[PDB]
Amino acid sequence: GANKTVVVTTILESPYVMMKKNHEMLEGNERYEGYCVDLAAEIAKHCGFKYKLTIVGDGKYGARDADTKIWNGMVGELVYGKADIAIAPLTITLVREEVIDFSKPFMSLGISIMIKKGTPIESAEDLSKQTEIAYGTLDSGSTKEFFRRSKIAVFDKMWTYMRSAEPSVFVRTTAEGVARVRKSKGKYAYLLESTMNEYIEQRKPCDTMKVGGNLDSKGYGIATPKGSSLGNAVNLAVLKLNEQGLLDKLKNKWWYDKGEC
């Protein structure tokens, strides 16, 4: 009893969560729009709770600091009791599954390569066998951890280069990585999840593209604190929304119906 408003942590990442044009004249959840905003409303309706969308303070997805062992990002918000649920493009990983709970995945993705159109790169192998074109990943994300922990020859070779490249090839936000690709005249390639790659490919000035296949296969899941009673209902809601076609409808809405290319 005593129903409480569910605190939802999320992250400003297009097209998942974006500020509306007139957000300063709106209140509460009405300030935001996007895929995860639509998904949050549906999860809440089917689970029967009220909620409040909050943007993660440090703007990070979630990683454990090697020195302090403290989790940052949305994962930290769940681990340390600042939020009840995370509805965001948060990647299911083993290290995260040990400290938080994930629903079954609501979106599939893989690590992919973003290039400026015309860049002579077709695969991760191509990137690893050359030096003219620099490449990097997002900081404090699952893509960086993938390369740091990989024992696969090609990916290990890529990590050896990235960790020691100077100036740093890592970026603080996805928008920073895309801008770097666009302004580097083809001398920077960005490693990011296929979902964000495919979205940017459909946005003006339509000068980037996804090349090659995905480097791995994984999914985004809705996250709750370990043992939270909310996890069960949220998981069943994700499965219901997928089977009813809602997740496919939302992706088409925010990726391709709004495409500008």
Ligand X SMILES: N[C@@H](CCC(=O)O)C(=O)O
What secondary structure does DSSP assign to 115-174, as a single string?
EETT-S--SHHHHHT-SSSEEE-BTTSHHHHHHHH--SHHHHHHHHHHHH-SS---BSSH
Does the footprint of ligand X cover residue 158 (CB under 6 A)? no
Does the footprint of ligand X cover residue 193 (CB under 6 A)? yes
Does the footprint of ligand 9TE cover residue 106 (CB under 6 A)? yes
- Using CA atoms, how far apart are residues 82 and 210, in angstroms rounded to an integer? 36
Q: Which is nearer to ligand X, 15 or 89 (CB)?
A: 89
Contact (Cβ atoms closer than 8 angstroms) between residue 182 and residue 208: yes
CB of 35 to ligand 9TE, least distance (A): 12
Residue type at position 117: K
Rounded to a whole number of angstroms, the CA Rg of the chain reads 19
- Among residue numbers 56 through 95, which ones bind a copy of itself (CB under 8 A)? 92-94
Tokens for 13, please give them: 């990442």
Q: Find out whether 225 is annotated in a ligand binding site.
A: no
Measure CA of the first residue to CA of the last residue in the chain; give whole Å. Answer: 50
Does the footprint of a copy of itself cover residue 233 (CB under 8 A)? no
| One residue of 15, 141, 221, 231 binding ligand X per CB under 6 A | 141
Q: Which is nearer to Zn ion, 33 or 125 (CB)?
A: 125
| One residue of 32, 61, 135, 146 binding a copy of itself per CB under 8 A | 146
Burial 109-121 (b: 16+ CB within 10 A, else e): bebbbbbbeebeb
Does the footprint of ligand 9TE cover residue 59 (CB under 6 A)? no
Question: How far apart, in Å, are the Cα atoms of 20 and each of 26, 29, 124, 208, 251?
Answer: 9, 11, 37, 25, 19
Candidates 46-54, 66-74, 99-107, 198-206: pick the segment binding ligand 9TE (CB under 6 A).
99-107
| One residue of 151, 205, 227, 260 binding a copy of itself per CB under 8 A | 151
Could you list the residues that contact a copy of itself (CB under 8 A)? 92-94, 97-98, 102, 104-105, 108, 146, 149-152, 216-219, 235-236, 239-240, 242-245, 247-248
